[PDB]
Amino acid sequence: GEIAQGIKEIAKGIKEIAWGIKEIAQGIK
Amino acid sequence: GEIAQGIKEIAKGIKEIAWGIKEIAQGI
Amino acid sequence: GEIAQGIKEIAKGIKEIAWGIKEIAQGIKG
Amino acid sequence: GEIAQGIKEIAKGIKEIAWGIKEIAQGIK
Amino acid sequence: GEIAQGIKEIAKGIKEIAWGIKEIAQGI
Amino acid sequence: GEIAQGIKEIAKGIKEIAWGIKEIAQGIKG
């Protein structure tokens, strides 16, 4: 499904955002 | 299903983003 | 439902992100 | 609906995140 | 419906967040 | 669908946010 695909792509991007935010948080410390 | 799984994975990632944002806010 | 629960947990996390971003924005004012 | 309510609350929080990010972006300049 | 409207408003807010993040990245 | 379109536009914006966050993270390395 187009919706199923979109949700999968959002999940992937959110995982990448979570990683980058942790990098920023550690990089500020 | 696949949608239920995707929503669960998004919820998990958003919880992790919320924690990291709090760490940035405290770190600043 | 599992979807209903997931959406509720996303709403909760988004509220927490919104709070932290506001704290950062104010904290950059010093 | 619980889903309808959740989506409304997410939309509200995303609007607030958009505002705060713009504040940070301007505050960095 | 209400869900379709909410998803449209989320899409709009995410576009605005994407622009602001790019401004921060360029500003840094 | 309107929902299908909205989800696609969210996916696109989230990919762009992910890119910008990576740029910030690397840019904080200098």
Author numbering:
A (entry chain A), D (entry chain A): 1 to 29
B (entry chain C), E (entry chain C): 1 to 28
C (entry chain B), F (entry chain B): 1 to 30
What's the paper's own text on this?
Conversely, both Gly variants scored more favourably as larger oligomeric states: the a = d = Ile variant as an octamer; and a = Leu, d = Ile as a nonamer. Thus, β-branched Ile at both a and d maintains the open assembly even with Gly residues at g. Although a larger oligomer was predicted in silico, the calculated internal energies for Gly@g were similar for the different oligomers.
Here, we show that pentameric to nonameric barrels are accessed by varying the residue at one of the h sites. X-ray crystal structures of the resulting α-helical barrels rationalize this: side chains at Z point directly into the helical interfaces, and smaller residues allow closer helix contacts and larger assemblies.
